[PDB]
Structures are given as C-alpha cells and as structure tokens.
C-alpha cells in the first residue's frame with residue numbers, strides 16, 4: 500500500500516506514534532516519506548547482507564527475521580514480511596521498540612539526514628487526522 504501523507508499521519512496517530520518518546524507526528528511522517536516514500540512494500544538490501552523492510556525500513560540484522568541475515572537478533576520478534584503489510588501495526592510496534600533503544604530516531608538514516616532539525620510539522624499541515 501502506498502499511503503497518502505495525511506492518511507499515514509492519521510494512521511500513525513491512531514497507532515500511538517504522535518509524541519511517542521517525545522517525537523512529534525511530523526517526525527514520523529517525514530521519516531516514512533524519506534525511508535519508503537510511504538510504500539509499505541519497500542525493501543532495500545544493505546551491504547552487510549541485511550535488508551530493510553516496510554514504511555520505516557526496519558532492518559533484518561537487529562529487528563526482524565528474514566531467514567537470510569547472519570547474526571540476526573530479531574529484537575522485534577517478527578518475520579520481516581510482517582513489516583510489508585497494508586496494516587501498519589507491526590511496523591509501528593517495532594518502531595516503538597527501536598526508538599526506545601537509546602539512539603532515538605537516529606536509528607533511521609533518512610530521519611537523521613533529512614528530517615532532524617527541520618520544520619517537521621509541515622508534514623502534517625492541512626491534515627484532518
């Protein structure tokens with residue numbers, strides 16, 4: 500599923516990401532925009548043999564199991580395929596674990612490089628949530 504911007508904002512808010520660990524909703528929408536272009540099915544392989552999955556590009560070395568990543572830890576205790584669903588629940592639940600882990604949203608490279616410190620509230624402007 501390719502979400503619209505306000506559609507994803509509303510879904511993320513329904514699933515409890517607004518201000519989760521102090522990160523406002525626009526941070527999460529901005530991260531999804533630049534990680535996956537709002538496409539739940541996005542997958543991208545990394546140099547180390549892991550792959551990133553879903554709307555928030557969660558990686559198979561630490562967070563989910565894809566059966567092909569040496570040293571997989573599966574800290575979200577989920578198959579990576581679950582992070583590709585049209586229903587964002589599994590991605591949200593895993594993202595909540597990631598952002599609680601010490602580095603906050605710096606776990607998402609696209610957030611660090613394209614969202615952090617910017618006017619992220621713009622990502623929810625005009626939306627009826």
Ligand SMILES: Nc1ncnc2c1ncn2[C@@H]1O[C@H](COP(=O)(O)OP(=O)(O)OP(=O)(O)O)[C@@H](O)[C@H]1O
Nearest residue numbers: 506507508509510511512513514585586587588589
């Ligand atoms: N009665 C239920 N039976 C089974 N699962 C449930 C039930 N109520 C809630 N859930 C679980 O809640 C998870 C997420 O909540 P829910 O499906 O209600 O979100 P939503 O508001 O429809 O989401 P979105 O706004 O993204 O469409 C679902 O994956 C489902 O597993």
Ligand SMILES: Nc1ncnc2c1ncn2[C@@H]1O[C@H](COP(=O)(O)OP(=O)(O)OP(=O)(O)O)[C@@H](O)[C@H]1O
Nearest residue numbers: 597600601602603604605606607608609611612615
């Ligand atoms: N892949 C990553 N996963 C999680 N946190 C990360 C990752 N890469 C960087 N960070 C953290 O994000 C924050 C900023 O990252 P960055 O690499 O830019 O900072 P740094 O090397 O500590 O120095 P500076 O920000 O001063 O240039 C730091 O806390 C860094 O530890």
Ligand SMILES: Nc1ncnc2c1ncn2[C@@H]1O[C@H](COP(=O)(O)OP(=O)(O)OP(=O)(O)O)[C@@H](O)[C@H]1O
Nearest residue numbers: 557558560561562574597600601602603605606607
């Ligand atoms: N400062 C830290 N010291 C030790 N372990 C840490 C630290 N920060 C995070 N971790 C743990 O390291 C593992 C990877 O966390 P991290 O936030 O770096 O993940 P990631 O951004 O998805 O991966 P990567 O850094 O490989 O790109 C998790 O178990 C996290 O709990």
